[PDB]
Structures are given as structure tokens and as C-alpha cells.
Amino acid sequence: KFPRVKNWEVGSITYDTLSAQAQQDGPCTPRRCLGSLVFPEQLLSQARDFINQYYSSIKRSGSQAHEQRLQEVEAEVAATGTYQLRESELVFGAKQAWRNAPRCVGRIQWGKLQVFDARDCRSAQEMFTYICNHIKYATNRGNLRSAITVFPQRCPGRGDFRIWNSQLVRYAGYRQQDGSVRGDPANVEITELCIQHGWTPGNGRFDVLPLLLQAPDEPPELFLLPPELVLEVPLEHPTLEWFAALGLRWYALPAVSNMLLEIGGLEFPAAPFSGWYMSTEIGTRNLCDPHRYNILEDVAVCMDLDTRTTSSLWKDKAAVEINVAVLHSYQLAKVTIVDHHAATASFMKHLENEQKARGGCPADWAWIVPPISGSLTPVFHQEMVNYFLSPAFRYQPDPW
Amino acid sequence: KFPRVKNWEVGSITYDTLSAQAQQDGPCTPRRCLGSLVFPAPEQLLSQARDFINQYYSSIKRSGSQAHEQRLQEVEAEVAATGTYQLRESELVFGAKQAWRNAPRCVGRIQWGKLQVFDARDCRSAQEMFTYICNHIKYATNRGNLRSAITVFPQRCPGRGDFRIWNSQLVRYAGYRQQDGSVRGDPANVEITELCIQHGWTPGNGRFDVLPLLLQAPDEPPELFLLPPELVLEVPLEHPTLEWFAALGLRWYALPAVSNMLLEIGGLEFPAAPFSGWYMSTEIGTRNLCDPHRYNILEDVAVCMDLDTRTTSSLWKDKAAVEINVAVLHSYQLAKVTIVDHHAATASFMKHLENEQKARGGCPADWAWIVPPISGSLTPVFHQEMVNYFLSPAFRYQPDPW
Numbered sequence: 001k002f003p004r005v006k007n008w009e010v011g012s013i014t015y016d017t018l019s020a021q022a023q024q025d026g027p028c029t030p031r032r033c034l035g036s037l038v039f040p041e042q043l044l045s046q047a048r049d050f051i052n053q054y055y056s057s058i059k060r061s062g063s064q065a066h067e068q069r070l071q072e073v074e075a076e077v078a079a080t081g082t083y084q085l086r087e088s089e090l091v092f093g094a095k096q097a098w099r100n101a102p103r104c105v106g107r108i109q110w111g112k113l114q115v116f117d118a119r120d121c122r123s124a125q126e127m128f129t130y131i132c133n134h135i136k137y138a139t140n141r142g143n144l145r146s147a148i149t150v151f152p153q154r155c156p157g158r159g160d161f162r163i164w165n166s167q168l169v170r171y172a173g174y175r176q177q178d179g180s181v182r183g184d185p186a187n188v189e190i191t192e193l194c195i196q197h198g199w200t201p202g203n204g205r206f207d208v209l210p211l212l213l214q215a216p217d218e219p220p221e222l223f224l225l226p227p228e229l230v231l232e233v234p235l236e237h238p239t240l241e242w243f244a245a246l247g248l249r250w251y252a253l254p255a256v257s258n259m260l261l262e263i264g265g266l267e268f269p270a271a272p273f274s275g276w277y278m279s280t281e282i283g284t285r286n287l288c289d290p291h292r293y294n295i296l297e298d299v300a301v302c303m304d305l306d307t308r309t310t311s312s313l314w315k316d317k318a319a320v321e322i323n324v325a326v327l328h329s330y331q332l333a334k335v336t337i338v339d340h341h342a343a344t345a346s347f348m349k350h351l352e353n354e355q356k357a358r359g360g361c362p363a364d365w366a367w368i369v370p371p372i373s374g375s376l377t378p379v380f381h382q383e384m385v386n387y388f389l390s391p392a393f394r395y396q397p398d399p400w
Numbered sequence: 401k402f403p404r405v406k407n408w409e410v411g412s413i414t415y416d417t418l419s420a421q422a423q424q425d426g427p428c429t430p431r432r433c434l435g436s437l438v439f440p441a442p443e444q445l446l447s448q449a450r451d452f453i454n455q456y457y458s459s460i461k462r463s464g465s466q467a468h469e470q471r472l473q474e475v476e477a478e479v480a481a482t483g484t485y486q487l488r489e490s491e492l493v494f495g496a497k498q499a500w501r502n503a504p505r506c507v508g509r510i511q512w513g514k515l516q517v518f519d520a521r522d523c524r525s526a527q528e529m530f531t532y533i534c535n536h537i538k539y540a541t542n543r544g545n546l547r548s549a550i551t552v553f554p555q556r557c558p559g560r561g562d563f564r565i566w567n568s569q570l571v572r573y574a575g576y577r578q579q580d581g582s583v584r585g586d587p588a589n590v591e592i593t594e595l596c597i598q599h600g601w602t603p604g605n606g607r608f609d610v611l612p613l614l615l616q617a618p619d620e621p622p623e624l625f626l627l628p629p630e631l632v633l634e635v636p637l638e639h640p641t642l643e644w645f646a647a648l649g650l651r652w653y654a655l656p657a658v659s660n661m662l663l664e665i666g667g668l669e670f671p672a673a674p675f676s677g678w679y680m681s682t683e684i685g686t687r688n689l690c691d692p693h694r695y696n697i698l699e700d701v702a703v704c705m706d707l708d709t710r711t712t713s714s715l716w717k718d719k720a721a722v723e724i725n726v727a728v729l730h731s732y733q734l735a736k737v738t739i740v741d742h743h744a745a746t747a748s749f750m751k752h753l754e755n756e757q758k759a760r761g762g763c764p765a766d767w768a769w770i771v772p773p774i775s776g777s778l779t780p781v782f783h784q785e786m787v788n789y790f791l792s793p794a795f796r797y798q799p800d801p802w
């Protein structure tokens with residue numbers, strides 16, 4: 001009942017005893033494994049279990065402070081139907097949700113996270129100011145710092161705080177009567193919503209979208225980000241002088257704004273968080289996916305590669321040089337970035353720390369292994385166990 | 401509803417209705433997924449036999465016919481008299497092809513209909529076993545124009561030991577435990593190498609010494625057979641533009657031939673049934689040569705390429721790995737030995753998924769093994785959601801016979 005977990009490069013064995021605490025059910029059954037799918041009053045028992053986590057975590061189990069908080073939340077729910085997190089419980093819950101995210105390779109950093117309490121917010125104009133402060137703190141002139149801003153929780157009878165954009169920074173995507181997309185094809189739908197709610201569209205490949213922010217029970221509001229606030233890195237290559245001329249760029253801050261944060265039975269539908277990029281996210285997935293910017297053949301043609309036979313590995317050669325450009329360009333601009341080798345080596349260290357700290361670590365192998373040079377990284381050779389712990393980040397229906 | 405399955409490159413959506421027919425359970429539960437783990441009686445025989453027979457008569461579009469009902473009655477009576485039964489020859493060919501078709505971790509299944517099936521069920525000794533294997537290697541190699549093949553030795557039966565091939569593949573290089581604690585040769589083969597020496601083989605001292613075969617006839621210790629060197633086709637590795645690469649003295653063999661899996665057809669078990677196809681270049685170029693626990697050449701190649709190996713951010717590992725894969729492909733093509741690169745292989749597997757969706761309403765597939773070990777998202781299978789499950793006929797892992 002305790003899964004055996006092997007590392008095939010070293011031969012080491014561990015046992016995952018934490019998977020026994022898996023609160024929710026995932027998508028897999030003895031009949032069939034669905035791990036590759038992207039999307040696959042009892043409030044009291046969740047709230048209770050989270051409080052024990054917290055007090056165990058501060059070595060104060062069953063103390064008087066423990067017993068007081070329990071009867072506190074009980075009466076709070078027997079008065080409003082919900083309850084309020086202490087400021088520190090909220091900090092601990094934000095960090096745990098990151099620490100519990102199976103698909104995140106960056107979790108070596110989970111204990112260093114700047115939590116911004118925005119639960120006293122109302123109106124989208126105040127959202128916009130909270131969001132802009134986050135962006136300024138987290139950017140930090142290119143020396144990136146992790147952060148999350150927690151907006152008011154869901155509660156009965158009242159609407160929700162939602163950020164309609166999937167990320168704080170996104171490039172527009174426009175269509176034409178030859179079907180194709182100019183800009184980011186991933187953002188065709190959000191972009192027509194922005195036009196639909198008032199935004200006057202640009203016409204470039206890297207037009208930074210406005211924010212569609214939604215306060216409870218009102219239509220969303222358009223907000224433009226100040227250009228000096230969004231840090232961008234123009235892409236060039238250390239030795240291919242023509243790479244600069246392709247006009248590629250990307251932005252500094254990966255900041256996810258459409259996921260729901262769950263803490264002790266409470267739910268926060270607006271709680272955007274940000275870290276810094278791993279280079280393959282930009283250089284492999286965003287620029288080279290066939291449904292994203294899809295620039296691989298452009299770059300290959302500029303490198304004079306043989307694109308008419310697969311076995312020349314022209315796609316592989318072009319992909320590496322794009323990733324080299326991404327790394328060189330972020331370093332040159334003094335913006336924090338981490339390559340997939342450094343990152344996966346740090347996750348291996350995270351797995352070892354977590355094994356000792358709590359007997360295991362929920363990890364999603366298909367998302368931990370980088371999208372280039374998979375078996376050149378140590379995580380490829382590491383067996384993993386995927387399960388859901390709480391507090392947690394979850395996907396949620398779009399607001400429309 | 402059955403599982404919904406999306407392709408993210410195209411946006412298209414299928415439902416895997418075939419997975420509802422899965423038998424032997426897998427290792428996942430709703431509480432935790434173990435998809436990343438490498439290794440995770442009369443009435444039961446009859447239900448398996450009946451289902452297989454139904455599968456056969458479906459395949460030739462003769463379900464419910466007179467011949468279909470008589471063959472079921474025939475298998476039922478043999479099981480009642482003997483506790484077991486025998487496949488018809490046609491059923492054995494069909495079953496071996498279905499086992500390949502059902503293999504979730506194989507990216508080469510577009511070919512599953514073109515499999516040469518050698519029937520060795522009347523084999524009686526380890527000497528005859530070796531003759532069958534030599535004829536298999538000769539047929540499959542075909543002087544570099546490789547042909548997929550399987551040789552099926554006698555099935556498991558009560559009161560008699562199994563035929564087994566002790567080697568994991570028919571062609572494997574020796575791995576000598578060096579006296580430091582290091583390895584000369586292939587470190588994956590230290591155990592089978594030491595068993596061959598312990599069984600009378602005089603070992604060499606190179607990095608690419610072909611191992612002998614240890615063949616086990618029922619109720620018999622394994623016996624040693626040396627493959628004839630003219631049967632074992634190899635490819636010296638060179639690079640089309642890096643001329644020093646040839647001086648590395650690298651080689652690989654032409655024929656990938658797995659010999660230690662168990663073939664299961666209609667409840668019957670064939671513990672010795674070696675099968676072979678042709679290589680995908682990343683198996684050689686990336687895993688066999690660049691795994692840290694295998695030949696581990698990545699750093700030496702990069703140094704020779706004059707890359708900056710003192711910082712990961714140069715992506716020296718990715719550059720040297722690409723050029724090693726280029727060399728593998730160039731060298732097999734120069735030697736006129738069949739090989740397929742990971743872009744063509746994964747493109748053909750997408751065509752197979754489409755065929756199977758139409759033919760059976762689904763395809764069991766293990767994403768982590770179908771996605772190649774370099775350039776994963778540059779290939780189309782990366783963006784294809786997959787459903788992993790066990791169908792029969794099947795190839796299964798089995799314990800090592802020692």
C-alpha cells in the first residue's frame with residue numbers, strides 16, 4: 001500500500017508514504033490510466049483538517065492555541081456560513097498550495113513566496129492597483145521575486161472576484177480571411193473579448209493585452225497596463241547576428257491569473273501568482289509549438305538547414321539555438337531565467353528534501369520532464385507518484 | 401461517458417471506447433497515478449480463450465458463422481479433457497500480431513500488420529532452439545533491409561519446465577565489471593555478462609563484444625551458444641561533418657530483438673517468443689549512448705566539439721546529443737541498414753492512432769514511452785493525450801529465470 005519509487009540512473013529506492021494522505025480522487029482507475037490528460041456545512045471538516053496541518057507545522061499540536069482556533073472557526077461558520085483565515089494561516093496555505101502542485105518543477109523555492117493580502121478589496125479599480133503593485137514588486141527591475149496576491153474568497157449569495165485573463169501578461173492574437181493568426185494563437189478568444197469590451201486592437205505580433213478584471217456582480221472592466229510596468233526581453237543570439245532581426249521578444253514575468261486557490265475548504269477564484277521562467281517554456285513551447293508562434297521553420301531556413309528530410313534533425317538543431325537565444329537574451333538584460341538542466345537538478349534536490357520532510361512528493365512526470373532533451377535531465381530517470389493534496393491550486397470554469 | 405481525449409495541436413477530440421474492454425488491471429487508483437513506474441485454472445482459461453476466438457472470427461469478418469461456433473465447441477472440449485488447448489496456426493499468427501498491436505509502449509505499431517510469424521511450437525531442444533533463432537536473425541536482418549519477425553517456441557504446459565531465453569535481447573554487448581567498480585562495455589548488461597562467463601564463455605575485453613546466447617530447454621540448465629559473427633550485422637558510427645567522430649571507435653548493432661518477454665494469447669502463455677523490428681535512432685543515439693548509466697559519452701563528445709561544458713546554460717548537452725543522433729542516422733543510412741528517426745516514427749504513430757480510432761474506437765498508449773527522449777514537444781505525439789490500458793493478446797514482462 002506504500003508505492004515503491006525507483007531512480008533508474010542511480011538505483012536508489014524510496015517509498016512514498018505521503019500519497020496515503022491524498023484528499024481528493026484523481027482521474028485514473030485500475031482499468032485505465034489518464035495521467036496524460038491536461039484537464040481530466042462539511043466546510044468544517046476541511047477547515048478542521050487544515051488547522052491541524054498548520055499547528056502540526058508550527059510544532060503546536062493540540063496546544064491551547066490549537067483548541068481555540070478550532071472553536072473559533074466553528075462559531076464563525078455558525079454565524080455567516082464561512083470563516084476567515086488568520087493572516088499567517090493564509091501565508092501558510094498559499095505556500096502549501098505551491099508546495100503541493102504536482103506539475104510545478106520550480107518547487108525548490110516554495111518556502112520563499114511573498115504573499116500579498118488583498119482580501120479587503122472591492123471594485124476592479126482596486127484590483128488593478130493591487131495587481132500593478134504585485135507586478136512592480138515581482139518584476140523588481142529584472143531580479144525576479146515570487147509572489148501571490150489573494151483577493152476576497154468566494155462566499156454564498158455574492159458573486160466572485162475573477163481575472164478573465166489567463167496570465168497578467170499576454171500577447172494578442174488576431175485572425176484574417178485566410179484563417180491564420182497574427183500574434184499568439186493561444187489568445188485569440190481573450191483578445192476578441194478585449195475588443196468586445198472596448199479595447200482598440202493593435203496589429204503586431206507582440207501586442208500586450210489589457211486586463212479584463214471583474215468585481216462581484218458587475219461586468220468586467222478594461223484596464224491598460226503602463227508600458228514601463230511590463231518588462232520585455234528582445235531576443236537575439238550570441239553568434240547568429242540575423243536572429244535579432246526576426247523581431248522576436250518575450251516578457252519577464254510569468255504570472256498566472258486564472259486559477260483557483262483552495263485553503264481549508266475556502267476558495268479564492270482570484271489569487272494570481274508569479275515566479276520566473278524556465279527557458280524551455282519560452283523557447284520550446286511558446287515559440288516552437290505548432291499551435292503557438294511556430295517559428296521553428298523560419299529559424300531553420302535562416303540557419304540554412306536541410307528542411308526537406310526529417311533525418312537531418314533540422315527541427316532539433318533550430319530548437320536548441322532558439323533556446324540558446326532565450327537564455328543569452330534574458331541574461332544580457334539581467335532578467336531572471338533558469339535553464340531546464342539547472343531547474344530539473346533543483347527539483348531532484350526538492351524531491352530529496354521532501355522525502356525527509358514528509359515522506360514523499362506529488363509529482364506529475366509528464367510535466368516535470370522538459371519538452372527538449374528529456375532524458376538528458378535527471379528527472380527523466382526518476383519514477384514519480386501523482387496525487388492531490390490540499391491546500392491546492394485548481395483549474396476552474398472560465399467566467400463566461 | 402468513456403474518457404475524452406484531446407489533440408492540442410489540432411484541437412480535435414476523440415473518445416476512447418476501447419478502454420472499457422480492458423481486462424488485467426493496471427497500477428493506478430483514483431487516489432494516486434503510477435503511470436511513470438517502469439515495472440508496476442479452467443474457467444478463467446475458457447473465458448480468455450473464448451474472447452480470443454471471438455477476436456479471431458471478428459477479424460476475418462466471420463463472427464457467428466458455423467466455423468466460429470464449431471471452433472468454440474472445439475476449444476471447450478479440449479480444455480475439459482486436457483485442461484489446456486492448442487492454437488490453430490492461423491490463430492497463432494493473428495494472436496502475435498494482436499499482441500504487438502496492443503503494446504502500449506511501442507511507437508512502431510503502424511507496422512503491426514506486417515509481421516513474419518515463425519512457428520517453432522514443435523521445438524524440442526536447446527540446439528533446435530538456437531537454429532530457429534539463427535534463422536530468425538538471418539531473416540530479420542536480411543543484409544540490412546530489416547523485416548519484422550517473431551519466433552514462437554512451445555507454450556507453457558503443466559508437468560514440464562519452460563523454454564526460456566536468458567538474454568534480454570538476441571544481440572547485446574558485454575558489460576565487464578571493472579575492478580575499480582566501473583564498467584567496460586554496456587553497463588546494462590553486467591548481470592547477463594557475468595552469467596555467461598559463469599557458464600563457460602571466455603570473455604573479451606572490448607566495449608562492443610557481442611554476448612553469447614544462454615538458451616534454456618524445459619527442465620534443463622541453460623546452454624551456451626556463440627552467435628556466428630557473420631549473422632550479427634553492425635554499423636560503425638561516423639559523423640557526416642565531424643571527421644574525428646569516427647576515431648571514437650563507436651558501433652551499434654543492426655537488429656533490436658527482445659527475447660525475454662512473455663507472449664499471452666487466449667489464456668495460453670509462451671515464455672519464449674523473441675521478436676524484432678528495426679531501430680528508432682533515439683534508442684541508440686540518446687539512451688544507449690548518452691544515458692549516464694550506459695555508455696555515457698555526452699561529455700566527451702561536447703569537449704571534442706569544443707563546447708563550454710562549465711555551464712549548463714550553454715546547452716552543450718543538447719548540442720552534443722543532437723550531433724550524436726545525427727551521426728547514428730547518417731551511419732545506418734551509409735551502411736544501408738533500416739532505421740527511423742524520431743520525427744518520422746512519431747508521425748507514423750499518429751497515423752496509427754487515427755486508424756485504430758476508426759478500427760477499434762481507441763488505442764492503448766503510454767505517453768511517457770511514446771514521446772521520444774529528445775525534442776519531445778517537437779514531435780506531434782507530445783500534444784496528443786493518450787489513454788493507457790491492458791488488452792490481450794499481450795506481451796508481458798516476466799521474472800528472470802535465474
Ligand code: HEM
Nearest residue numbers: 098101103104105106109146147273274275276277278393
Ligand atoms: C519561481 C520559479 C518557478 C518556476 C521556474 C516554475 C516552473 C513551472 C513550470 C515549467 C510549470 C509547467 C507549466 C507549463 O509547462 O505550462 C509550472 C507549473 C505550475 N506552477 Fe510553477 N514555477 C515557478 C513558480 C511558481 C509559483 C511561485 C507558484 C505558486 C505560488 C507556482 C505554481 C504552479 C502551479 C500551480 C503549476 C501548475 C500549472 C498547471 O497545472 O498547468 N509555480 N511551474
Ligand code: HEM
Nearest residue numbers: 500503505506507508511548549675676677678679680795
Ligand atoms: C518495426 C519497427 C519497430 C519500431 C521502430 C519499434 C519501436 C519501439 C520503441 C522506440 C519502443 C520503446 C522501447 C524502449 O525505449 O525501450 C518499443 C517498445 C515496444 N515494442 Fe516496438 N518497435 C518496432 C517493432 C516491434 C515489433 C515487431 C514488436 C513485437 C512483435 C514490438 C513490440 C514492442 C513492445 C512489447 C514494446 C514494449 C516494451 C515495454 O513494455 O517496455 N515492436 N518499440
Ligand SMILES: Cc1cc(N)nc(COc2cc(CCN3CCCCC3)cc(F)c2F)c1
Nearest residue numbers: 038254255256259273274275276277278281
Ligand atoms: C508561476 C509560474 C512560473 C513559471 N515558470 N511558469 C508558470 C506557468 O504555469 C502554468 C501553465 C499553464 C498552461 C495553461 N494551459 C493553457 C492550455 C490548456 C491547459 C492550461 C497553466 C497554469 F495554470 C500554470 F500555472 C507559472
Ligand SMILES: Cc1cc(N)nc(COc2cc(CCN3CCCCC3)cc(F)c2F)c1
Nearest residue numbers: 438656657658661675676677678679680683
Ligand atoms: C522490436 C523492437 C524494436 C525497437 N526499435 N525497439 C525495441 C525496444 O523494445 C524494448 C526495449 C527495452 C529496453 C530495456 N528497458 C529498460 C528500461 C525499463 C524497460 C526495459 C525493453 C523491452 F522490454 C522492450 F520491448 C523493440
Ligand SMILES: C[C@H](O)[C@H](O)[C@H]1CNc2nc(N)[nH]c(=O)c2N1
Nearest residue numbers: 036037038366367782783784785
Ligand atoms: C497532451 C499532453 O498531456 C500535453 O501536451 C502536456 C504534456 N506535458 C506538458 N508538460 C508541461 N510542462 N506543460 C504542458 O503544457 C504539457 N502539456
Ligand SMILES: C[C@H](O)[C@H](O)[C@H]1CNc2nc(N)[nH]c(=O)c2N1
Nearest residue numbers: 380381382383436437438768769
Ligand atoms: C522513470 C521513467 O518511467 C523511465 O525513465 C521511462 C520514461 N519513459 C521511457 N520511454 C521510453 N521509450 N523508454 C524508456 O526506457 C523510458 N523510461
Ligand SMILES: [Ca+2]
Nearest residue numbers: 176177178179
Ligand atoms: Ca476569403
Ligand SMILES: [Cl-]
Nearest residue numbers: 254281282286
Ligand atoms: Cl508562458
Ligand SMILES: [Cl-]
Nearest residue numbers: 656683684688
Ligand atoms: Cl536497445
Ligand SMILES: [Gd]
Nearest residue numbers: 301302303304
Ligand atoms: Gd544566406
Ligand SMILES: [Gd]
Nearest residue numbers: 640641642643
Ligand atoms: Gd569537418
Ligand SMILES: [Zn+2]
Nearest residue numbers: 028033428433
Ligand atoms: Zn495513472
